[PDB]
Amino acid sequence: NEFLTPRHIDVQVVSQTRAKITLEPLERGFGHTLGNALRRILLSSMPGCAVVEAEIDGVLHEYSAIEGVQEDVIEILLNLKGLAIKLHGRDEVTLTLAKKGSGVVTAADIQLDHDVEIINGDHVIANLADNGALNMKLKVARGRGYEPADARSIGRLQLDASFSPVRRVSYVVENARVEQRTNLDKLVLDLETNGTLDPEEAIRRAATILQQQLAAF
């Protein structure tokens, strides 16, 4: 018959997270078969960046603690899994961190790079004191989903990385009108991420995954 092809991208950015988008007026009945399909693609596989290995020049294993700091090595590595890192033209970089004195080590203390961008700068990593300091190297990579260290000289500390920028996806279906038909609906995605990827670029990336799985059909 006749179908109205949705060709529009209306993104309402209120903050770095929770970006509400509205694709276009869909056909009658395509609000749920296309909205639930896009939700199962975003929450499943979206490229992200995560720290896969951290090397500290003072500690051997993640269980033994270091002097001068307050958080344990396990607590320090668990704080690295909440970093929002964005890579532009590289697939695997190597960051470093070195701070002394009685200062709260945050995500902004990492050495700046041209192809590395950190969204969260107030993320507390560790708390130091006048007794000692810490110095470590960070290695991030590109991935698609959850990959533990078991499925992936003695100072190498591997971490279970989760390459998923999306956190919560919800969709509602309302009524639309283009002065052409009577029964037309629009789709509104309440996409919420960690601020790494663009919400307008996530829809074009999710539409390509669905189209590639149907081209071979």
Binding site: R40, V169, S170, Y171, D190
Partner: protein, 49 residues
């Protein structure tokens, strides 16, 4: 000579979980986040009893 080994055991299908009201059970499957029932806001549940 005695050594000490540290093992970090995650939760896998087969482990026994229980509550404080005498309701024990064994985890059967680990479903993805997209399969779990969610509310209107999109917040998925963690455990289905």
């Amino acid at each position: 000579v005695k050594v000490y080994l540290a093992i970090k055991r995650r939760i896998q299908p087969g482990d026994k979980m229980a509550g404080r009201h005498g309701n024990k059970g064994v985890v059967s499957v680990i479903m993805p986040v997209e399969d779990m029932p969610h509310d209107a806001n999109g917040t998925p549940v963690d455990i289905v009893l």
